[PDB]
Amino acid sequence: GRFLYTDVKYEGQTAFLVDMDTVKARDHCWVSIVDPNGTMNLSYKMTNFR
Amino acid sequence: MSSLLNSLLPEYFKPKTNLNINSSRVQYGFNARIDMQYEDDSGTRKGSRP
Amino acid sequence: MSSLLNSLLPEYFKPKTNLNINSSRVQYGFNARIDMQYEDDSGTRKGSRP
């Protein structure tokens, strides 16, 4: 459940046009928001490995 | 070299003796708990993936 | 002996005057909250019975 930059599948330089209207909601916790505004800060902690 | 390859396993995991493999495919992973905290110009939101 | 048998009831419970019993069977108990924490050789897991 992570994103690597190699998923773009293009070595070299480019600019991306992100579709902000068609943002689907697959898995939603209470944290999950659709409309970001300004400077986005996300602080997560991982505990209880099994 | 047992002592070398035994060190690579994570500190929390200690596997048992036998393993009855009955297929040509095995998934291996862990069940972690994520405690996310979001902050932007609109406001704050706190969640938790159990 | 009121003062003797009154002492047996738990400190949190203080019952009211009247009780309209309308059957030959009465369940009595409490609704508690349990916060369990598990640890073994495989790893750790944390839950909560609300």
How far is the C-alpha of A31 from the C-alpha of B38, rounded, in Å?
A: 7
Amino acid at C24: S
Residue B42 CB contacts under 8 Å (≥ 6 apart), including other chains: A33, A35, A37, A38
Torsion of CA A23, A25, A26, A27, to 10 degrees: 130
How far is the C-alpha of B43 from the C-alpha of B45, rounded, in Å?
A: 7
| Shortest distance, CA B33 to any CA of chain C (angstroms) | 9
How far is the C-alpha of A28 from the C-alpha of B44, rounded, in Å?
A: 16
Interface residue C47 vs chain A (CB under 8 A) = no
Interface residue A50 vs chain C (CB under 8 A) = yes
How far is the C-alpha of B49 from the C-alpha of C50, rounded, in Å?
A: 17
How far is the C-alpha of B42 from the C-alpha of C24, rounded, in Å?
A: 60
Q: Could you identify the residue written with the tokens 């609704």?
A: C31
Residue A25 CB contacts under 8 Å (≥ 6 apart), including other chains: A32, A34
Number of B/C CB contacts below 8 angstroms equals 12
How far is the C-alpha of C39 from the C-alpha of C46, rounded, in Å?
A: 9
C-beta of residue A32 within 8 angstroms of C-beta of residue B28: no
Chains in contact with chain A (at least 3 beta-carbon pairs closer than 8 A): B, C
Q: What is the DSSP string of A5-23?
A: GGGG---S-------SSS-
SS3 C4: helix
Task: Please report the beta strands in chain B, taking only residues with DSSP state E, as ranges in sequence order.
Answer: 33-34, 37-39, 44-46
**Contacts of the segment B25-31: beta carbons below 8 A, 24+ positions apart:** B30/A49, B30/A50, B30/C43, B31/A48, B31/A49, B31/A50, B31/C43, B31/C45
How far is the C-alpha of A36 from the C-alpha of B48, rounded, in Å?
A: 19
Residue C50 CB contacts under 8 Å (≥ 6 apart), including other chains: C33
Resolution limit, Å? 2.9
- The separation between the first and the last C-alpha atoms of chain A, rounded to the nearest angstrom, is 17
Q: Do A48 and C42 touch (CB under 8 A)?
A: no
Structure tokens at A48: 């209880």
Q: What is the DSSP string of B1-50?
A: -HHHHHHTS-TT----S-----SS--------EE--EEE-SS-EEE--B-
SS3 C13: coil
Question: Which among C41, C42, C46 has CB closest to B33?
Answer: C46
